Amino acid sequence: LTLRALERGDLRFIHNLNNNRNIMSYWFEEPYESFDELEELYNKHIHDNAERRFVVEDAQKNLIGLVELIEINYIHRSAEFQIIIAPEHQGKGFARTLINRALDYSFTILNLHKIYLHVAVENPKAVHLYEECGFVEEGHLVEERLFKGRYQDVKRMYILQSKYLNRSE
């Protein structure tokens, strides 16, 4: 598996990944639905550093998934992490490798201090995946985000740069 910076040609893949996520899609904190809306927003934020995205491909260049770093704050050296694996490739064992490649980039190239992510409390499976990748819960946000017209509680988990880089030393 390979992480490649997002290109214009990858926007179709991005649009298709939102097929039945049953939630409003956002591009640099701006909502969109159509492909033409997405392409206009991509042209607008092509140099915006607030968010960073990587397309995950395999040896045969099949589009496996998407790695996103959003809310990139260079003051506090923080960023939020989101990973989306295409439905067809969700049951193969790629999540852990992609989470670690994303953490390596965040902590070695972006030189960030802290990476955090949000997981729905009703999704306990994801909590253990991220716990097994080194993340630890730092918050249980009450009625944080709306899903299907009802407020949900969300867990916030984190991992620090010093731990990730010096874990085996």
Confirm or reject binding of residue 86 to its own copies (CB under 8 A). no
Shortest Å distance, C-beta 94 to its own copies = 21
- Cα distance from N-terminal residue to C-terminal residue, the chain: 26
Q: Which amino acid is at 168?
A: S
Residue 34 gets which letter from DSSP? S
Q: Contact between 143 and its own copies (CB under 8 A)?
A: yes
- Rounded to a whole number of angstroms, the minimum distance from the CB of residue 38 to its own copies is 10
Helix (H, G, I), strand (E, B) or coil at 62: coil
Tell whether residue 167 is a contact of its own copies (CB under 8 A): yes
CA distance 165 to 129: 20
113 is known to lie in a ligand binding site? no
Instruction: Dig out the tokens for 146 from the structure.
Output: 């709306």
Q: Distance of alpha carbon 157 from its chain centroid, rounded?
A: 13
Find the binder of its own copies among 59, 60, 109, 169 (CB under 8 A): 109
Residue whose CB is less far from its own copies, 74 or 92: 74
Q: Which of residues 40-69 bind its own copies (CB under 8 A)?
A: 40-41, 46-47, 49, 52
DSSP assignments along 80-113, one per residue: EEEEEE-GGGTTSS-HHHHHHHHHHHHHHTS--S
Interface residues toward its own copies, by CB under 8 A:
5-8, 22-24, 30-37, 40-41, 46-47, 49, 52, 74-76, 78, 107-111, 113-114, 136, 138-146, 148-151, 156, 158, 160-161, 165, 167
